[PDB]
Design a protein around this ligand. Structure first.
Ligand SMILES: [Zn+2]
Lengths: 101, 60, 85, 50, 119
RNA sequence: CUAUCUAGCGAAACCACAGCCAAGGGAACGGGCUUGGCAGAAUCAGCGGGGAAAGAAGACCCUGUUGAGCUUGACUCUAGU
RNA sequence: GCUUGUGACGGCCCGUGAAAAUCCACAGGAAGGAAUAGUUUUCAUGCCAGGUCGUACUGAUAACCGCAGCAGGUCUCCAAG
RNA sequence: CGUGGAGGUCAGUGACGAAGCCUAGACCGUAAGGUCGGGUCGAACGGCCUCUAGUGCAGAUCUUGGUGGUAGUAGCAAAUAUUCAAAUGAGAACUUUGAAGACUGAAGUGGGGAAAGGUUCCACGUCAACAGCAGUUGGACGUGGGUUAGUCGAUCCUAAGAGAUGGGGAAGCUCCGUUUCAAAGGCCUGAUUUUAUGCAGGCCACCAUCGAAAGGGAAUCCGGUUAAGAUUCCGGAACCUGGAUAUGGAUUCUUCACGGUAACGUAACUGAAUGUGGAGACGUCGGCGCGAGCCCUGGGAGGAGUUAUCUUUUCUUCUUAAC
RNA sequence: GUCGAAUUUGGGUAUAGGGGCGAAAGACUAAUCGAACCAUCUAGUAGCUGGUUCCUGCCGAAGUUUCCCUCAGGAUAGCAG
RNA sequence: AUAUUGGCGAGAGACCGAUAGCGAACAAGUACAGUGAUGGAAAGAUGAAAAGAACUUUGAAAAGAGAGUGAAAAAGUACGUGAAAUUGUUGAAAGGGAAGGGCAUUUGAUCAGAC
RNA sequence: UUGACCUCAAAUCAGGUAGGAGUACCCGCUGAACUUAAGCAUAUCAAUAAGCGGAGGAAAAGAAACCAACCGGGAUUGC
RNA sequence: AAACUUUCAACAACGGAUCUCUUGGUUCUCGCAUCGAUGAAGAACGCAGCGAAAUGCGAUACGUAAUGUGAAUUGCAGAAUUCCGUGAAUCAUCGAAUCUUUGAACGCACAUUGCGCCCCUUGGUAUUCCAGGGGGCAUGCCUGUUUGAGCGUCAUUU
């Protein structure tokens, strides 16, 4: 016979993912030091559509705790999160939607 | 109108004409001819006339 | 329509000139010569391509340096100059 | 094409130099056998494939 | 005709340099007057004469640096021997004649004795 | 517009040798053989009865200790697991 | 009116419709500065240079590909009454 | 019996003509074949005894080459269509010129390009071959001429991708992998003006490179000019980048501008590291507003056409670039 | 037939032969596809088809036995020189 | 001491002789075909010497007819010789839907021997 | 504080060397199938063709952790 | 009876067999050991008074230098002093050189005749900008050198 269609998918030649317009790697913030003992406040700049998934993504901006820098995060938006919100990320952060606990 | 080396550029052509002929070049135009050779259009300043220089070389 | 009408749609060269051999065998997208194996360091040649290697072997070209080595051997690989014998 | 690389136009100049009949005096040489140019090429008969 | 190389050897590097740029000028009007007349086989002699001048010039500076590097190791690579890549890498005769004392003693004490057999 | 006739230009398929029938016998359906009918140069435009016309070492059928694509609790193995 | 550019809107999407070089701006206050004299070349004027390769022509019932000067094929711009 | 070659011998034949070829001329043999005569030709070749083999053809849809009948035959009929005269020439249905009649009818039989071709472009000479008739003509033949850029492209960036390196596999040609278990790199300002850049320092953490002549992108327009080239030449008028650089201008003793309530304005009007923001930077369809070119049209100033009759008439010029 | 989109198409690029790609016809993968093309192994094997070259003289058959995955073939006896 | 179709330089042959011998005696791995890897021919001979035909004449020319060179143009760069298929011209003969063949002889043409 | 050792770096530091070509003959490594067996699978082609690495004028082997059982021979290579 | 068809002969055609040649091939023997980073083989483009190719060569380009021989080269033209000669030749030989652009191919690249950096020097009123000439700038690895890193580590301090 011949190799079959589910066999031909692992070569990853034409069966790859379409990733030109996908926004980024929507990950959480890093667990460096400022969440394991306190928190850090962040701002939501814009909530945008993501090609490929049906859930909007948020652009959450934090201040760098070690340099004069404005490191920005790519989170999956919670229903209720709005542009201009404040986001708290830490261990002692409150129990409010939008916070990372 | 001069036939110049294929390896030359317009700076060398301008300098070479000055050395050989004691004349000033205003501009240089280059084209590689369809027989794989370089032709140069060397325009003198108004201080010089190419009519009296072409026969000085010996072609006219 | 796979014959004459389709032959009017071939206008993009799959091969260009090859730097190392020049035989219009540099496959463009693969960036590899079909004939001489360029840009591999070695030269493509095979014991089944006996006709092919006979075509591109030592001696089929100008032999710009190896021609004189044979008589240089005969003269003991000497040095200097002849002294007007 | 109009826009072309220097390789192509250089190799066309080679093929334009070589496009003319045999020199006449060569057939007057001693022990000459070449009767004409057997490598003459025209643009309408065979293509250069360059 | 042309130039005689054995006459070029006597002149110094400054006289040859003037002659080379002198011959360069002369070949330039030969080219200018060739395009009018049908044939000019004199350009051949000037071309060869320039080559002869250039060649004789070259040997004068090449020997100047052989004497500059005379009597020392590390000659310039273009002035060394072009015997053969394999032969140039080959071990010298001094380095191929090195012998151990254990064999050196045996060579001194016991060489092949030249013997004949008649009686 | 062709076919038709003219000036110019000018192929191919195919061709053992060839080209009138009846019957006979014959590889059981002859252009040739036998007995008969007959039989007159050189030919032109058509025609589709015949030349079992041409185009292919039958693709059907069968045989061959000749295959291949495919299938499976065939035989013998094997990647992977 | 035709063609084309542009503006402000509307419809549509489980589709919401690239990247970088490059260019500018802002926040910040390092440093450098004034009096018989200093500072700005994001104001104006004034000076010099701008290399290399391409550039002709056809682009098709005759220049490309179809054994050819082949009723085939081959992406596109302008478009009068 | 015959053929290619080898040992021996006929002190064999031959430029006074070897071999070959042709010959409804002769002779021998049952035959394979052998011999002779005549013509043509020009340099080698046989009889006999033996030796040796790439040694004898009618066929293999045999191989290569060559040639017929078919046969002056099939044919040379798609794409509306030619005609008259003059010129040239040996020769004109086909070339040139004029006239007439037509067609493509602007998603053309028009004017430019991309891919491809490569000189086909243009001039002169020219028709043996090719243009399935012709040929004086030609994209043919012979000989030459012709492509001019800071601004148009490439050159730079990156996309999907390709791909070194540090490494890890693989006997191995090589495979993986592009920031990965790397000590991975370079810019500003000082200090000495024995002076090269050692030495004062701080800053930087991304990370080879290749990959689009339709993506992104610094800047040139008009007129004229050739047989053949032009946003490239010439004349004029511009702009951009880079680099040196002086004057005018601007500003200060309230040291680094003022005015307006404001949105904001101007000729400028110190601002290193560092950080933030914008442009680059973006779908498609629907209808609506505006601009540009064209189209239509009036008066007027010119030119051409019709005019038996009519037509203040029909056609045509009245343009304005980048900056 | 369809003709505003599951639309048409150029250029770039990715996918390579028991492999690709397939809105699935065993379709397409350079006029080649139910396993492309190129060279080599390779003068691949054939119990089967076709052909197999000078003369004369003398002699002159067989289609039958037995065994064989044997029945279009061989071995064997016989017939022949 | 052994091996050797590659390289270099030699000596040979009961080898082949231009469809043979290497694919290639020659501007042969060339012309040419394919995108490509690859595939791949044809093609030697005037004469001792070009002495390669001066000159006249017909034709637009190519060429023809003379003249000439040469031992020979029955050697004219379509060139040593120059077969067959196939073709033209002249001569001979036969032919009512094939032709060709055999035995025998008439007729016509030609011919050897013998004297 | 200073001077060593070990280990690991850097330099367009001084001097070098490997590559690639050719590859008939040699030393390895990988490795078929056509075919024969009147089928065919072990077997055979064949420890071969193809593929890869590595040399020389020869290579390789080579002076026994050998052969023998004789009254012992005595590196290897080749006939 | 012509024509036409068929057969043969002569002459003339078409065609390239045969015959006779051979600077070629093939096979066997003999002798020799010699490519390349000091840049091979190969490729591209160029070079002659008149060459397209083959053959030769590389911007010093059918070649320069050196040695030998000793009068040519030749299709045409030209040059003659170089002809009792330190000298013709498309001569042989070849020990000195040049050897464009590439190529294992090496500053980075390459479907581009694209893009940098360092050293010396020259010009534009210039270490910085532009241009020219010359020399450089690959990787693995060995030996040596020099500047270093590591609480890996010894000794010494204060
Ligand atoms: Zn190549």
């Amino acid at each position: 016979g011949r190799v079959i269609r589910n066999q031909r998918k692992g070569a990853g030649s034409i069966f790859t993912s379409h990733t030109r317009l996908r926004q980024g790697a929507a990950k959480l913030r890093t667990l460096d030091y400022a969440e394991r003992h306190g928190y850090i406040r962040g701002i939501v700049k814009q909530i945008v559509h993501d090609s490929g998934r049906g859930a909007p993504l948020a652009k959450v901006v934090f201040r760098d705790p070690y340099k004069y820098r404005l490191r920005e995060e790519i989170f999956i938006a919670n229903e209720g999160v709005h542009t201009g919100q404040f986001i708290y990320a830490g261990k002692k952060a409150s129990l409010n939607v939008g916070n990372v606990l | 109108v001069f036939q110049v080396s294929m390896k030359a550029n317009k700076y060398q052509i301008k300098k070479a004409v000055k050395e050989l002929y004691e004349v000033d070049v205003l501009k240089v135009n280059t084209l590689v001819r369809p027989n794989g050779t370089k032709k140069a259009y060397v325009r003198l300043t108004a201080d010089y006339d190419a009519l009296d220089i072409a026969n000085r070389i010996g072609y006219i | 329509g796979k014959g004459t009408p389709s032959f009017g749609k071939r206008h993009n060269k799959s091969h260009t000139l090859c730097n190392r051999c020049g035989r219009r065998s540099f496959h463009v997208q693969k960036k590899t010569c079909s004939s001489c194996g360029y840009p591999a360091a070695k030269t493509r040649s095979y014991n089944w391509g006996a006709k092919a290697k006979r075509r591109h072997t030592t001696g089929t070209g100008r032999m710009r340096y190896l021609k004189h080595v044979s008589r240089r051997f005969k003269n003991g690989f000497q040095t200097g100059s002849a002294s007007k014998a | 094409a109009a826009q072309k690389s220097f390789r192509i136009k250089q190799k066309m100049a080679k093929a334009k130099k070589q496009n003319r009949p045999l020199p006449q005096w060569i057939r007057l040489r001693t022990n000459n056998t070449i009767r004409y140019n057997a490598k003459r090429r025209n643009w309408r008969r065979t293509k250069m494939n360059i | 005709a042309g130039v005689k190389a054995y006459e070029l050897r006597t002149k110094s590097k400054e006289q040859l340099a003037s002659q080379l740029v002198d011959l360069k000028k002369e070949l330039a009007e030969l080219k200018v007057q060739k395009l009018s007349r049908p044939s000019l086989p004199k350009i051949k002699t000037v071309r060869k004469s320039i080559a002869c001048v250039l060649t004789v010039i070259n040997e004068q500076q090449r020997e100047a640096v052989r004497q500059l590097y005379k009597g020392k190791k590390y000659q310039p690579k273009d002035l060394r021997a072009k015997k053969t890549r394999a032969l140039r890498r080959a071990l010298t005769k001094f380095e191929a004649s090195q012998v151990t004392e254990k064999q050196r003693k045996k060579q001194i004490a016991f060489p092949q004795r030249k013997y004949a057999i008649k009686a």
